[PDB]
């Protein structure tokens with residue numbers, strides 16, 4: 048029940064983080080394609096957005112470990 | 117049961133927070149790409165929106181920990 | 186059974202509230218992008234909409250805690 | 255089972271209400287952006303629509319409480 | 324089992340009713356935006372449409388109570 | 393199991409009926425917005441379409457009651 | 462397990478029938494809006510399409526009762 | 531397990547058959563609206579497509595009864 | 600378990616076949632509407648695609664009976 | 669469990685093959701409608717794709733039989 | 738449990754392979770329709786893509802057999 | 807449970823890798839269709855992307871085998 | 876349950892990682908197709924975005940292995 052739990056926490060975190068990052072990176076690539084002169088600003092939004100999106104998934108990863116250990 | 121419970125809360129909190137942030141950040145990137153002069157304006161809305169969206173997932177994270185410990 | 190319930194109430198509340206906020210913020214960002222002179226109007230709509238959207242998820246959080254304590 | 259029941263009721267009510275409100279609020283923001291002169295009319299519709307949308311989720315929340323207590 | 328039942332009926336009725344109303348309300352907001360002259364006409368369709376969509380969810384709420392009592 | 397059954401039948405019926413009505417009413421609202429002179433014509437189709445869509449849901453409600461009683 | 466059976470069959474039939482009719486009616490309404498002259502012609506297609514769509518859901522209801530009785 | 535089985539096969543047959551027919555009828559309605567002179571040709575395609583779509587669902591309905599009886 | 604199994608195979612085969620036929624038929628209708636001159640060509644493609652699409656669902660039906668008997 | 673396994677394998681293969689074929693045939697119908705001159709080359713593409721798409725589902729059907737027998 | 742396992746692996750591999758192939762082939766058909774000069778180039782990409790997409794599903798089929806034997 | 811596990815890991819890996827490749831391949835086909843001059847530039851992106859997308863699915867295949875052995 | 880756990884974490888991480896990469900790679904291909912002169916800038920974004928998206932899935936695989944061992 049600890050294994051099963053740790054899996055669910057980690058698995059959902061993976062899905063959460065990957066997809067969120069993908070959405071953000073994709074938006075960045077599309078934006079940069081549309082407006083190459085906005086390279087920097089768009090790259091900044093990506094660099095701010097990604098960690099924000101990963102925050103809660105990262106915490107869920109820690110919780111997965113706490114369950115396992 | 118506490119392991120499984122803690123995993124469900126944290127896992128759904130991860131999905132919730134990550135995706136919500138991605139939607140907000142993507143909207144900010146797209147708006148910025150369309151009207152670069154609004155970059156500060158949209159950034160401000162992102163900075164307000166993200167914590168608002170992360171609030172409940174964060175509380176579910178705390179509940180996840182209360183279930184575990 | 187209590188751990189499982191608390192998690193389900195909290196996890197669904199997280200998904201509900203985060204995504205609802207994201208939808209509202211996204212709309213505010215898109216509206217402001219189209220009509221920047223209306224940002225104050227749109228912000229007021231966002232600041233009314235968000236708590237209204239968070240209302241039931243918050244009660245579900247409370248219900249989650251009542252299950253645990 | 256009272257715990258699981260209370261959770262399911264509260265969790266679904268939360269998804270139900272939050273998303274319903276968000277959809278209505280989004281429409282209002284989109285409409286107001288598109289026709290700023292209609293801002294009062296659309297705000298009235300939002301103020302009528304939100305309670306209507308929340309009516310059944312609220313009743314579900316009460317039922318959630320009746321099951322828990 | 325009665326608790327679980329009452330929760331499912333109430334939770335689904337909530338989702339059913341909330342989303343149906345939001346769909347209807349969103350439509351009259353968009354229509355009113357496109358044709359402000361049809362404000363009263365569209366609003367009437369909203370006031371006819373909502374009870375109809377809420378009819379079965381309400382009956383499910385009653386059924387939810389008959390299971391609890 | 394009768395409680396579960398009555399809940400599933402009533403719950404699904406609610407989702408079925410509410411959404412179906414919403415789809416029909418939205419189409420009526422959208423049609424009326426495009427063709428204000430066809431208001432009566434479209435309202436008639438709505439008044440014909442709603443009971444047909446509700447027919448099986450209300451039958452599932454009866455069955456929900458039969459299971460409960 | 463017969464209560465569960467009668468419920469699953471009735472609930473699905475409800476979703477099946479209600480949604481199918483909604484799709485057909487909405488199509489009739491949209492078509493009439495697009496080519497009003499064809500109102501009667503489309504209504505006949507609606508009156509033919511619905512019973513055909515409701516046929517198997519109706520059989521499923523009969524089966525639901527055969528299980529319950 | 532026969533009640534449950536019969537219900538699964540019948541419920542899934544209902545959804546399969548109803549939605550398939552609705553899709554074909556919607557297409558016929560949409561096409562008639564665009565090419566009124568093709569009315570008969572399109573109506574014929576509907577009268578061929580429906581039984582073919584309904585073929586397996588009907589068989590599944592039979593199989594449902596073989597389980598129930 | 601033979602009842603459940605047979606139900607799952609038959610039920611999924613019904614969804615598979617019915618929906619696939621609906622998709623193919625819809626496409627034949629839309630094409631015919633688009634180019635009435637190709638009415639027989641598209642009709643041939645429909646008469647070829649449907650049996651191919653129904654192939655595995657039919658086999659699944661046979662397997663369903665082999666489980667039942 | 670052999671009945672459950674054979675069902676799941678056959679049912680899923682049914683969905684897999686029927687839908688894949690439908691998607692390929694639909695595309696063939698739309699291409700032909702759009703460019704009737706390419707009818708031959710598109711029909712060839714359909715005759716290559718369909719067996720390729722049905723391959724693994726057919727293998728899964730064999731496995732379904734092995735499980736049964 | 739070996740039967741159930743083999744079914745899951747083979748069933749999901751079927752869905753994976755069929756749908757992936759359908760996606761790739763559909764793209765090939767659409768591009769060839771728009772630019773018939775490239776039918777050779779496009780068919781080559783289709784013939785490189787399909788085995789790649791089928792690789793892991795094929796492995797899952799092998800694993801399905803190892804479970805069975 | 808080792809049969810179950812190995813199947814889940816292989817099945818999900820199959821869906822992951824196949825769909826991922828299909829998406830990437832489709833993108834390559836669409837780009838090549840629009841800008842044939844970029845045929846080899848796009849093909850390189852496909853050859854970088856595919857193994858990157860297959861990475862984690864490959865590891866999940868190994869894990870599937872380790873579970874069985 | 877360790878087999879179940881290790882499977883769930885690996886399978887979900889597979890879906891997470893594969894889909895995310897495919898989304899980023901696709902966006903890179905589309906962008907490059909539209910602005911070939913930005914191929915280097917877009918490729919860089921792909922090489923930054925991919926490991927960011929794979930980060931949590933990779934961790935979830937490590938957790939998968941920690942469950943197996």
Ligand SMILES: CCCCCCCCCCCCO[C@@H]1O[C@H](CO)[C@@H](O[C@H]2O[C@H](CO)[C@@H](O)[C@H](O)[C@H]2O)[C@H](O)[C@H]1O
Pocket residue numbers: 705706773774775778842843844845846
């Ligand atoms: C019934 C409808 C018939 C429509 C026929 C329309 C013909 C139009 C004129 C033909 C010219 C098209 O030219 C098209 O250009 C691209 C480059 O831009 C070519 O180039 C592509 O294929 C060649 C041949 O393998 C590769 O070496 C090359 O690297 C690749 O980019 C295509 O092979 C060619 O088909």
Ligand SMILES: CCCCCCCCCCCCOP(=O)([O-])OCC[N+](C)(C)C
Pocket residue numbers: 062066069070073074890894898
């Ligand atoms: C349980 C595992 C299931 C995982 C399912 C993951 C699904 C992820 C879907 C993410 C893809 C969405 O991308 P996006 O950037 O919004 O663009 C699409 C929207 N526009 C076209 C309007 C731009």
Ligand SMILES: CCCCCCCCCCCCOP(=O)([O-])OCC[N+](C)(C)C
Pocket residue numbers: 062066070131135138139140142143146211
């Ligand atoms: C189980 C986990 C499933 C996760 C599924 C996540 C999918 C989230 C959808 C991705 C975000 C959708 O794009 P968006 O920002 O709304 O804008 C789309 C419209 N425009 C681009 C034109 C503005």
Ligand SMILES: CCCCCCCCCCCCOP(=O)([O-])OCC[N+](C)(C)C
Pocket residue numbers: 131135139200204208215
């Ligand atoms: C298990 C948890 C699953 C969570 C699934 C989350 C999915 C959230 C999807 C929400 C996406 C919101 O897009 P949208 O409002 O349609 O954008 C429309 C933009 N325009 C109006 C300009 C077109």
Ligand SMILES: CCCCCCCCCCCCOP(=O)([O-])OCC[N+](C)(C)C
Pocket residue numbers: 200204269273277280349
């Ligand atoms: C488990 C919980 C799952 C939560 C899933 C949430 C789904 C929310 C989907 C809501 C999507 C937004 O749609 P909408 O704004 O009505 O229309 C789009 C606006 N236009 C009409 C202009 C295009």
Ligand SMILES: CCCCCCCCCCCCOP(=O)([O-])OCC[N+](C)(C)C
Pocket residue numbers: 269273277338342345346349350
């Ligand atoms: C677990 C339960 C999760 C429930 C999730 C429910 C999500 C329901 C979202 C329904 C939003 C639909 O909006 P709408 O007004 O039809 O616009 C649709 C946009 N177009 C008009 C352009 C098509």
Ligand SMILES: CCCCCCCCCCCCOP(=O)([O-])OCC[N+](C)(C)C
Pocket residue numbers: 338342346407411415418419422
């Ligand atoms: C578990 C229960 C979850 C319930 C989820 C229900 C989802 C309901 C979505 C309903 C969407 C209704 O959109 P629609 O009027 O067909 O599109 C209109 C598009 N045009 C105007 C362009 C024609």
Ligand SMILES: CCCCCCCCCCCCOP(=O)([O-])OCC[N+](C)(C)C
Pocket residue numbers: 407411415476480483484487488
């Ligand atoms: C348990 C889950 C139950 C909820 C399921 C709800 C399903 C409703 C899906 C939507 C049904 C109505 O869309 P429709 O008329 O085909 O229009 C779409 C086609 N056009 C936009 C071109 C007109």
Ligand SMILES: CCCCCCCCCCCCOP(=O)([O-])OCC[N+](C)(C)C
Pocket residue numbers: 476480484545549552553556
């Ligand atoms: C309870 C589980 C089953 C309930 C799910 C019901 C699903 C109903 C799906 C009906 C929606 C599809 O409609 P349609 O007419 O093909 O238009 C499709 C045209 N577009 C692709 C442009 C939207």
Ligand SMILES: CCCCCCCCCCCCOP(=O)([O-])OCC[N+](C)(C)C
Pocket residue numbers: 545549553614618622625
């Ligand atoms: C129990 C689960 C049952 C789920 C049943 C879901 C059925 C969904 C069927 C959806 C079929 C939609 O495709 P289609 O109308 O061919 O595309 C039409 C696209 N255009 C209009 C632009 C051409």
Ligand SMILES: CCCCCCCCCCCCOP(=O)([O-])OCC[N+](C)(C)C
Pocket residue numbers: 614618683687691694
């Ligand atoms: C129980 C499980 C049942 C699952 C049933 C799933 C059915 C899914 C059917 C999906 C059909 C997708 O059609 P499509 O032509 O790609 O979209 C329309 C594309 N165009 C706009 C170019 C036309």
Ligand SMILES: CCCCCCCCCCCCOP(=O)([O-])OCC[N+](C)(C)C
Pocket residue numbers: 683687691752756760763832
């Ligand atoms: C239980 C198993 C259910 C499987 C359901 C699978 C759904 C069908 C697969 C996805 C079909 C849609 O994607 P696609 O054909 O690449 O693009 C559609 C055409 N556009 C490019 C215009 C969007």
Ligand SMILES: CCCCCCCCCCCCOP(=O)([O-])OCC[N+](C)(C)C
Pocket residue numbers: 752756821825829832901
């Ligand atoms: C267990 C059941 C699994 C079912 C999995 C179904 C997967 C369906 C994936 C469908 C992915 C479709 O995305 P896409 O074609 O890249 O975008 C379409 C838009 N454009 C190409 C125009 C840009």
Ligand SMILES: CCCCCCCCCCCCOP(=O)([O-])OCC[N+](C)(C)C
Pocket residue numbers: 821825890894898901
């Ligand atoms: C376990 C089941 C797994 C199902 C996974 C389904 C994956 C579908 C992900 C792809 C869905 C959306 O595609 P996309 O690339 O964002 O295109 C959006 C169109 N533009 C690129 C033009 C913006």
Ligand code: NA
Pocket residue numbers: 073074075077078142146
């Ligand atoms: Na974007």
Ligand code: NA
Pocket residue numbers: 142143144146147211215
């Ligand atoms: Na946006």
